[PDB]
Amino acid sequence: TSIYPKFRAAAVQAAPIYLNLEASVEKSCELIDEAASNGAKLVAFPEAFLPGYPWFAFIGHPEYTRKFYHELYKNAVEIPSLAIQKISEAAKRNETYVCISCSEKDGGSLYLAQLWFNPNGDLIGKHRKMRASVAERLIWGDGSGSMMPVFQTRIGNLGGLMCWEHQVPLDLMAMNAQNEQVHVASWPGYFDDEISSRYYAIATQTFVLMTSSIYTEEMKEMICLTQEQRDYFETFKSGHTCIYGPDGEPISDMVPAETEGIAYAEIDVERVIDYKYYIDPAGHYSNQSLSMNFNQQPTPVVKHLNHQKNEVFTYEDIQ
Amino acid sequence: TSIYPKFRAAAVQAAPIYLNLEASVEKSCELIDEAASNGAKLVAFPEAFLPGYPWFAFIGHPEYTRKFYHELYKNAVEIPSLAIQKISEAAKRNETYVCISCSEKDGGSLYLAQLWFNPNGDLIGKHRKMRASVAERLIWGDGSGSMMPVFQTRIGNLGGLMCWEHQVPLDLMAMNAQNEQVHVASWPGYFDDEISSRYYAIATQTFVLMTSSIYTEEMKEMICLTQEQRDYFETFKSGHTCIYGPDGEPISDMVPAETEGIAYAEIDVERVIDYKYYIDPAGHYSNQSLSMNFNQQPTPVVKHLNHQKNEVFTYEDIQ
Amino acid sequence: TSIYPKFRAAAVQAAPIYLNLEASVEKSCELIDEAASNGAKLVAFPEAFLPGYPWFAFIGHPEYTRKFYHELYKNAVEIPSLAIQKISEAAKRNETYVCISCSEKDGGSLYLAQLWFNPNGDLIGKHRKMRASVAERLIWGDGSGSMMPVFQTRIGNLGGLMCWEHQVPLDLMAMNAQNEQVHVASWPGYFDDEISSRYYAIATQTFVLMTSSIYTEEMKEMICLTQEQRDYFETFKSGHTCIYGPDGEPISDMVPAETEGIAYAEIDVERVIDYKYYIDPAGHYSNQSLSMNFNQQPTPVVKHLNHQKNEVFTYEDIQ
Amino acid sequence: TSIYPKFRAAAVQAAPIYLNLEASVEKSCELIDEAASNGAKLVAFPEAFLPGYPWFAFIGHPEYTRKFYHELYKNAVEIPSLAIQKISEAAKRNETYVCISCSEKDGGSLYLAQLWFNPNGDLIGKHRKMRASVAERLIWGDGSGSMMPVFQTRIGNLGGLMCWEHQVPLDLMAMNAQNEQVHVASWPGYFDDEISSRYYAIATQTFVLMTSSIYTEEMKEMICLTQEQRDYFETFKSGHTCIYGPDGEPISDMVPAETEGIAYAEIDVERVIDYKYYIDPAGHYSNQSLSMNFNQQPTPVVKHLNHQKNEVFTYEDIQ
Amino acid sequence: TSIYPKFRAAAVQAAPIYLNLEASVEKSCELIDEAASNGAKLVAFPEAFLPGYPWFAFIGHPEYTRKFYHELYKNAVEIPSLAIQKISEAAKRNETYVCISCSEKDGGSLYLAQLWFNPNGDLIGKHRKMRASVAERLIWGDGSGSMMPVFQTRIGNLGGLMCWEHQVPLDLMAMNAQNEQVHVASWPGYFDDEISSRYYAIATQTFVLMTSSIYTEEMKEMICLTQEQRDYFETFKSGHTCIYGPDGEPISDMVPAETEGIAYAEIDVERVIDYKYYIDPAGHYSNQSLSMNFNQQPTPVVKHLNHQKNEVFTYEDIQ
Amino acid sequence: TSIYPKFRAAAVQAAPIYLNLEASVEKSCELIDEAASNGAKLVAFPEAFLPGYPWFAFIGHPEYTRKFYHELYKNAVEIPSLAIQKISEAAKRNETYVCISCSEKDGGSLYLAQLWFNPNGDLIGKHRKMRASVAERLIWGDGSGSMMPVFQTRIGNLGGLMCWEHQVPLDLMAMNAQNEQVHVASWPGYFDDEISSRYYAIATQTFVLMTSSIYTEEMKEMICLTQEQRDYFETFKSGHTCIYGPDGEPISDMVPAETEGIAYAEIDVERVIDYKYYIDPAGHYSNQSLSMNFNQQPTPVVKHLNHQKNEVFTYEDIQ
Secondary structure, X not given: OOOOOEEEEEEEEOOOOOOOHHHHHHHHHHHHHHHHHOOOOXXXXXXXXXXXXXXXXXXXXXXXXXXXXXXXXXXXXXXOOHHHHHHHHHHHHHOXXXXXXXXXXXXXXXXXXXXXXXXXXXXXXXXXXXXXXXXXXXXOOOOOHHXXXXXXXXXXXXXXXXXXXXHOHHHHHHHHHOOOOEXXXXXXXXXXXXXXXXXXXXXXXXXXXXXXXXXXXXXXXHHOOOHHHHHHHHOOOOOOOEXXXXXXXXXXXXXXXXXXXXXXXEEEHHHHHHHHOOOOOOOOOOOOOEEEXXXXXXXXXXXXXXXXXXXXXXXXXXX | OOOOOEEXXXXXXXXXXXXXXXHHXXXXXXXXXXXXXXXXXXXXXXXXXXXXXXXXXXXXXXXXXXXXXXXXXXXXXXXXXXXXXXXXXXHHXXXXXXXXXXXXXXXXXXXXXXXXXXXXXXXXXXXXOOOOOOOHHHXXXXXXXXXXXXXEEOOEEEEEEEHHHHHOHHHHHHHHHOOOOEEEEEOOOOOOOHHXXXXXXXXXXXXXXXXXXXXXXXXXXXXXXXXXXXXXHHOOOOOOOEEEOOOOOEOOOOOOOOOOEEEEEEEEHHHHHHHHOOOOOOOXXXXXXXXXXXXXXXOOOEEEEOOOOOOOEOHHHHO | OOOXXXXXXXXXXXXXXXXXXXXXXXXXXXXXXXXHHOOOOEEEOOOOOEOXXXXXXXXXXXXXXXXXXXXXXXXXXXXXXXXXHHXXXXXXXXXXXXXXXXXXXXXXXXXXXXXXXXXXXXXXXXXXXXXXXXXXXXXXXXXXXXXXXXXXXXOEEEEEEEHHHXXXXXXXXXXXXXOOOEEEEEEOOOOOOHHHHHHHHHHHOOEEEEEEOOOOHHHHHHHOOOHHHHHHHHOOOOOOOEEEOOOOOEOOOOOOOOOOEEEEEEEEHHHHHHHHXXXXXXXOOOOOOEXXXXXXXXXXXXXXXXXXXXXXXXXXXXX | OOOOOEEEEEEEEOOOOOOOHHHHHHHHHHHHHHHHHOOEEEEEOOOOOEOOOOHHHHOOOHHHHHHHHHHHHHOOEOOOOHHHHHHHHHHHHOOOEEEEEEEEEEOXXXXXXXXEXXXXXXXXXXXXXXXXXXXXXXXXXXXXXXXXXXXXXXXXXXXXXXXXXXXOHHHHHHHHXXXXXXXXXXXXXXXXXXXXXXXXXXXXXXXXXXXXXXXXXXXXXXXXOOHHHHHHHXXXXXXXXXXXXXXXXXXXXXXXXXXXXXXXXXXXXXXXXXXXXXXXXXXXXXXXXXXXXXXXXXXXXXXXXXXXXXXXXXXXXXX | OOOOXXXXXXXXXXXXXXXXXXXXXXXXXXXHHHHHHXXXXXXXXXXXXXXXXXXXXXXXXXXXXXHHHHHHHHOOEOOOOHHHHHHHHHHHHHOOEEEXXXXXXXXXXXXXXXXXXXXXXXXXXXXXXXXXXXXXXXXXXXXXXXXXXXXXXXXXXXXXXXXXXXXXXHHHHHHHHOOOOEEEEEOOOOOOXXXXXXXXXXXXXXXXXEEOEOOOHHHHHHHOOOHHHHHHHHOOOOOOOEEEOOOOOEOOOOOOOOOOEEEEEEEEHHHHHHHHOOOXXXXXXXXXXOOOOOOOOOOOOEEEEOOOOOOOEOHHHHO | OOOOOEEEEEEEEEOOOOOOHHHHHHHHHHHHHHHHHOOOOEXXXXXXXXXXXXXXXXXXXXXHHHXXXXXXXXXXXXXXXXXXXXXXXXXXXXXXXXXXXXXXXXXXXXXXXXXXXXXXXOEEEEEXXXXXXXXXXXXXXXXXXXXXXXXXXXXXXXXXXXXXXXXXXXXXXXXXXXXXXEEEEEOOOOOOOHHHHHHHHHHHOOEEEEEEEOOOHHHHHHHOOOHHHHHHHHOOOOOOOEEEOOOOOEOOOOOOOOOOEEEEEEEEHHHHXXXXXXXXXXXXOOOOOEEEEEEOOOOOOOOOOOOOOOOOOOHHHHO
16 A cells, blocks of 8 residues: 655764764664654665774775774674664654664675664665775775665665766666665765755655754864875865755755754655646656666575585594 | 357446445345346446546546545455455355456455356356556556466356456467357447457357446546646446347347446357357367467466475463 | 768748748748858758647647647658758759758658758658657657668767657667767757757767747747647747757757747867767776667568559540 | 788887877887887887876976876877878878777877788777876876777787786686787886786786886976975886796896887787696686676766768858 | 478497598588498487597696697688688588588687588587586586587487587486487497497487597607507597487497498388387376476677677778 | 774694694694784684595696595594594683694585684584695595584684686675684695785785794605606795785785794784775675575485484393
8 A cells, every 4th residue: 555654854974973882873873863852764875984984095005095994994884784683773762763874784885884773673684885986996896786775664765876876877777676765865964965865856756854963073173184185185175964845845954064053844655746747757757668677576696595504523522 | 068058147237436445245145136137147337337437547647547546446446355255145145146347456456357156156266457548557567378267167168358368369369279159258338349349259259248338427427627638538438237148149138328237148058169260260160371379377476485484482482 | 971061050930931931941941052152051940840740739639629720731842852952952063061850751651850961962861859848749750760870071060859858868879879060959949958959969969959949929829729729838838049068068059939040059070089988888988787779770561562653544545 | 811921020119209199100100110120020119108197287386287288189099190190101001900008089088099001001000008107197098898809910919008918807708718929018118017918928828018108307307396306206116127938937128228210020920829738717727616707888977879870051052 | 290201310329530620521521422322311420520629638747738629720610701601512422411520610719519401501400518527527618408409300309419418307308398210329439338328319319320539640759749548549439330210229339449331220210109109208107296397598708789790991091 | 883993813734643633733723823923813723624625636646646635535534533532622722713724524524623612611613625726636526515613702704715716706705795804724735825815915015924834754755756747846836924904915924934833913803894894795885786695405315304313222221
C-alpha cells in the first residue's frame, strides 16, 4: 500500500571531532538525542561525518595526503563495530530514523557510505558513493548498483546521495526509478550545495534534507602544517543546511553559516503527488527512445562461494 | 489449438462510486455476481471504472485538474493490492472471465489499464492504453507494445481496447495479427462509441462487447464548482452498452440510456469463420506493399537487471 | 578536431506577435539583425517563439483550447516554408548561428521544435521536444531520439533543450554523451528557469544561454475572453533571460523582467576543460553498474520506403 | 595455427617534449625509425609518452594540478587525429609493430591508452589502463574489460599493461587466459619497475619489454613553480628499460639511467614452451576451486543504438 | 526412442610416427580407410595416438622429459587444425564413427583427449582424461566433468575412457549413469591389463573395444639416448587389442602382440539387455545409502563473458 | 575491530634429518626453542620440512622415485599424530605462533601442507598446496579452496603459501580477499624465490617471511645412487631466507647461503596501511569487468554423512 505520512525531519549542520571516531560518535549520539527530543523522526548528518572529511587531500600532494590517510584509516567505521552499536542504540532510544555518513572499511580499503538506521535500531542498509570527486579518489573506492537503496519505511520512501552524486543524471534516475519520496543530500561544505539539492528536489519530486558540515579550528591545526596551506584552506567556502520541498522551495530556515545547529521541517509526503502530476521522468514524463540499465547485482572483486569458517584443533584435543 | 466455443457474455453499463476505490470495487464484485448468476462466462466493465473516469479534466484548466488528480492518484489500483484480490476472488467464485478497466499506479505515475482475470482467479494479463486521448494526457501515461495481449482461453481468443484505441488502425492490426475472436470495447461514456465498435467488429471479425459508463449526481456535485462548469458538464452525451456479431450487427439489446444494466448475448466463436472467409487483413486479405512493425519488447525507462535483495542487520544482531 | 573557440553569444528576451506567423518572423529577423550588429555570433530565442506559446491551453478546458489551437495550427511553421526561408536568409546575411523555437507542422500534427541555422543559412538540424509538459500535450506530439543533435560548428559543440527537458536526467545524459559545449535553454516564461538552467550548466559542463519570452497585452486580449480567465492569467510569473558559464554562474546581466532586450556574453569554450577535470558524467565520472540506452533510430509512424511520384498524364497527350 | 617466430624487439627509454603533442609525435617517429633501422620488428614506448606523464599531479594539490591538466587535455591524442596518422605512417614505412602509450581523449574525458600498430599501418587495437595510481586518478578515467587485447600476429601473441597493472593479479590472469607470448610493460619512471616486470615474465611465461621514461629539465621548469616543489620533485627516482626472457632473466642490455637509448633483444617465441612445461596458471597449473570471470563486453556510459546522421537543408535548397 | 542396432566394430593396434603430427594423421587416415573398407562402422584408436604417447616421461628425470615435451607440444592437436580437418574428412568419406585419441592443445597447456567423429564428418564431442597417470602429470592437465560425453548415435550409445580411468570407480559410474552401451578403452601399452577392460565390460554392461599401441624402433632411437635407458625401456611390456562383450568374454580375435593389425567384431547392442537384467549399478542394482554427485559444469580457469572480436582502424581509414 | 600489532618474527633456514620424521620433529622443536628465546612471536619453516622435500623425484625416473616415495610415505605426518603433539607442545611452551610445512598423510594419499599452531598449542588450521609442481605431482595430491586460511590473531592476519603458489595470481587474490597482513613464503630451495616473494609482498601489502631449506651430505648420499645422479644433483642452486616489508624491501639480513640460521625482523602491522593507500587489488584498486570466484566448500572425494562408531560384541557377552 502507498502511504503518505507526515513527520518532522531534522537536518544537522555540525562538525565532528576531526579524525576521532570515538568523539565523533559521541557527538553524533548527542545530536540524535537533541533532534529527537525536538520532535524529529529522521535525522540526517553531513557527508563523511565519521570521523570527518579528508580536507587534507585538497591542500597537499599525495605523499602529504598519505600521512593523514593513515590516521583516517585507523578511525574508519567497520561493520560490525562499536560505532554501529552506538548509532543503533541512539536510534532505538530515540525511535527515529538516522542517516549518518561515514568512512567505511571493508577489508583493506576505505569507502564513503551513508548508513541507515531504523527506529528498531536495525542497520537497514547502506549506500556507498558511486564515484569519488577529484581528490576523494585518493582516499575512497567506488560504489556499486547493489548499494543504491530506497527504503519503503513508515515515513515514506527514504533514500540519499552524497555531494556531487546529485550532479550525475544516472544516479538521479536510479533513485527516481524506485519512487524515492524523502531524500537526504549529504555535503561536506566546500562544494556548492544549493543548486544541486534544489534541482534534485524538483526533478525527483522529493523532500530534500540538505545536510552540510562546518570547519573547526582544531582541524586547521591538525592538517595545516605550513602558513601557505593555512591560508589556502582558509579560502575554502562554507556549506549550507536546509530542507526543500518537492517544488524546490525551502520549508525551513537555513542554519547560520559556520555555526552548529539543526534545521526542522514538517514533511508532508502527500505533496509529492502534486508534482508527480507535472513530471515523473521514470514514469509518464518519458520517451521510449531513451532508457537506462540499472544493474543491482553485487560486484565484489572476489565473490565467495560456500564460505566456511576454520575449526581449530584444540591443545587438549591434540594431547 | 483452433477451438470454437459457445458461451454467454455480459457487457456492463454502470457507474462507480466516484474516486472511491473500495466502494467501486464492492460495486464491481456485485456486478460480477449478478452477471455470473444470469449465466455469463465473460463480464466487461467500462473504461476507467476503478475508481472512475476523470471528467474533471475536460471542464476546467490544468491547475483545476490537479486538485482532483490528487484524489484519483490516492485511489488508483496497484498491482498487487486489495482491489486486485477482491476482483480475483469474485472471478474465482463466479468462475467467469473478467475484463475491468482502472487507473493503474506503477511507480509514481498513473496508467489506464484493462485487467483480465480467468475463472481460476489469476490475473492473466493487463493492457495499458497505448495513447491517452484529448485531456487524458494530463492524467495517464502511454502504453507499450508489450502490453497488448490476446489470451487463448477456453472461451476463445479474448482481447480488448479502450475508447479511441478503436480509431487507431495500427491497434486494430495488432489485435488482428494475434487472431482476436472476442473483443471487449471499454468506453467512458462521452465519445461516440457505436461506429468505432461496429467497424472493429467488421474489420477484426470479432464479437465486440461494447461497455460504457453513465453519469451520477455524486460525480457532478464533486467535480462541478461553479454553475458554468455544471452547465457545461450537463451537455455531455451518454454512452451505449451493446454486443455485436462479427458482421457488426447487434446480438443483444442496447441498455437504456443513463441506467445501470447488463447486456447478455450468445457468443458463437465458430461464427467468425464465415467472416474470415470474406476478409482477414492480417492473413489472406493483405498486399505485399504494406506491412506493420509490432514491437512487443518491454519499454521501461529504467531496466532493472539482477534485482536482488540486500541483507538487513537487526538491533539484536548488532547487540 | 577538438578546437576551443572564442565568440560572442546573445540570448533574447522577447515576445512574438501572438499567433501571427508573418509578424513573428519579421520580429525574429529584426532581433537577429540587432543581435548580430552587436557582435553576436549565436542568437537564441524563447520556447515556441514562432508564432507563440499556447498560453490558452492553461486557462481553460480542452474545448476552449480547441478554438485557439485552430489558429495556432494555421500559423505553424512548415519545412520548407516562407518562415524557414526568411530566418535562413537573416542568418546568412548576418553570418550567425541561429537557434529559433517554433510550432512545427508535419502532415496533420504539430510539434515543438528548435530550428538551427548556421552562418550560411543552412537549416542544419532540428530538435523536437521529447515530451509535452502539462497542457502542451493537447497541442504538440513527442520527439524522437533521432532529433537530439549536437552540432560540431566553428563555435563549438552546440545543442539545445526546451523547458522541462532540463529536468529529465536522460536528456542531459544524451546531450552530455555528444560532448555538447554551448547549450541553448529555451523557456516559455511561466515555469521556474534559474535552478534548472544553472544545474544543467554545472552537470553538462556547458555554457547555457537561457532565453525566455514575456507576456504582451495583445496576447491577453486574444485569449482572456472572460474576467476569471484574465485574472487567472494575470497571476502567471515571468521568466528570466541570462547566460551562464560551465560552473553555473552568470556571465551576463539579467534582462529586466517583462522587458524586451538581449543578454550578451563572451563565450570562451576553453573554460569547459577546467570542469571536465571535476566531473563528466558520460566519461570518467561514471560507474559501470549504471548506463543509458540512447536510441537514435528515426521513429515516424509510417516509413515511406522507395518513395516515388505519379505519372501525370497531361491533357495534351490524351488528345 | 600455432607459430613460434623469431624476431628482434626494441624497448625505448626516452622522454617526450613535455605537454607538446606535435613534438612528442615527431620524436616518436624519429625513435621508431632508429629502432627499426637496427632490425627491430617491435618498438615499445614508455607510459603516457604522448604528450607526457602528469608529474605535476604528484607535486601539488588538486587545484594546482588543474592548471596543467588544462594543457595536457589540449594535447591529448584523439582517434582519429594527426598523431595517430603520423604514428601509423611511421609503422608502415618501417614495417614494424609499434606499441605506444598516450593520453587518449574520448569525448570529454582523458584515458591512458596503449596504441598498437602493425607493419601495414593499421591501428590494430587499444588498451586502456584499468585503474589509476595514488595520483593520476585526477587525470584519467578507468578502462574496461573490452580493451585488454592480445593480438595474434606475425611475431607472436602481443599484449601490454602499464605500470601498476602488473601488480594486479586479475590483469595478469586476463592476459594469460589469451595465451600472450610477448609483452610490453610501460612505466613512467618513478615506480619500481624491475620486480613487477620480472614476476610478470615468470608468471605469464612471456618475454617482457620493459620501457621507462626519463625526467628532463624542461619538464622541471614547466611544472616546478616554487623552490620547495623543485626540491621535492628532484628526489623522484628514475626508471629503467630492460628486456626479459620467459624465466625473468634479462636477455638484453639495461639502458644507462636517465639517458635516452634503446634496448634490443633477440626474441625467440619458442622459448615459452619450456616454461609452459613448468607452470601455466590459466591452463594445467590450476585448481577448480579458484576461477575468474572475464567480462569483455563494452562498458560505455551511453551506448548508441541505430546511430544516424543529421542531413542538412542547404541554403541553396531553402531559397 | 530406444534402439538396439547391429553393426561391425573395429579396434586398431598400431603405432604413430613418433612425435610427428602430419605423418601420424596420414597413418590414422589410412587405418580408417582400411577398417571401414572392411565393413567397420566404428573405428577406435589407441591412447594418445596423435602424435604419440610420452614414453620419454617414464625413462628419465623431468629435465630430460622437458626436451621431448618441447617436440610433443609443437605437434599437439589443436581445434580447429589441419589434423581435425583430415580426420573429419576421413570419417566422412568412409561414413564411419571414429574415436581417435591425441595430445590436444588448448591455450598454453596440453591435454589428453579422445576426439569423436560421426559419419557426416562432424566432431560430435571430446573426452579429456580426468587425471594423468604417474609421469603423465608432467605433460597433460586434468579434464573436467563437462567432458565425459556419451553419444546417442545410430550404432548405440558411445563412450570411452583412457588407461587407468577404467580403474576409477566414479568414472565407471559416470559412464553408467548415461546408459553407455559401446565403449572404447584406449591403452598405450605397458599399463594394459586385460582385467580392467573386461571388468569395465561386465560392470557397465557394455561392449568394450580395447585398443593398444605398439613400440617402434624410431621411438626407441629418438628417446633412448643412453644404453641404460635403452635397456630399461626395452623392458616395457606390450599391450593387447581385442573386443569384449557385455559379459566380459572376447567376441573377436587378439591382434598378435607388438604388430600392426585390426580386430573386428559384430556388435549387437541388444545383448546388453540380457545383462541389465542381472546388474545395473546406476539403476535397480543400487542402495539409497550410496550416491554419486556428477557435476557437468564447465570448469575453465577463466570464463569469457560476452566475448568480443578485435577491431582495427585500417591504414587507409587512418589516411 | 581491527588491530595493527607489533612483534618480532623469525624465518628459519634449515634442513631436516632426511626422510626421518622423529629426528626432523626434534630439530623443529629445537629451532622453535631457539627462535622464540630470541623474542620471536612467529616462527616459519621451509617447505616440506617434515620429513624433507622429495628431491629424488627430480633426478630419476618414476620407478626410481617409487622406492624413496615408499620411505617418505612411511615418514609422513598425520593428524592426530605424535609429530603434531610435539610441535604443539613446543609452540605452547614458547608462546609463539608456528608455521611448519610437511608431507601430510590423509587416508592413502600424501599432501603438502602448512600447519599453523598458536601460542596455546592449538592446531588452528592447515593449508594444502593447491597444485603440485613439476615432479611433486608424482608425490602429492592437490589442494582445495577450503584449505586457504587467513588467521585473525593477536599478531596480525597470518597466512602462508608454498613455493610456486606465489606465481599463481588466483592464489594471491584468494589471500588478498581475506586481508592477509603477515605472510609465510616457504620454499624448498631449488626454485627461484627472491623475486616471487618480493612481488607477493608488494602486490598483497604484506610482510613476507621467505623461508628456504639447504642441502645436506646425508641427503646426497641417500638419493644419489649413481655418479651421474650425484653430479646432476650437485648443480641444484640454493634458496635464501629473508623477511620483506609491505614494499618488497628486505627488513633483515639474509641468512648465509648453505648454512643453518634464523632471520629476525620487527613487524609493524601498521605499515600495511601506508600501502593499502595506493594499491589494494581486492578492494579499491579493482575494475568491475574482472572478478574472481573463490569456492571454499570442502571437496573430499567421498562425503561421509552421519558418521558412526561400530558396535563390538565383546567375547564375554557372547559367552
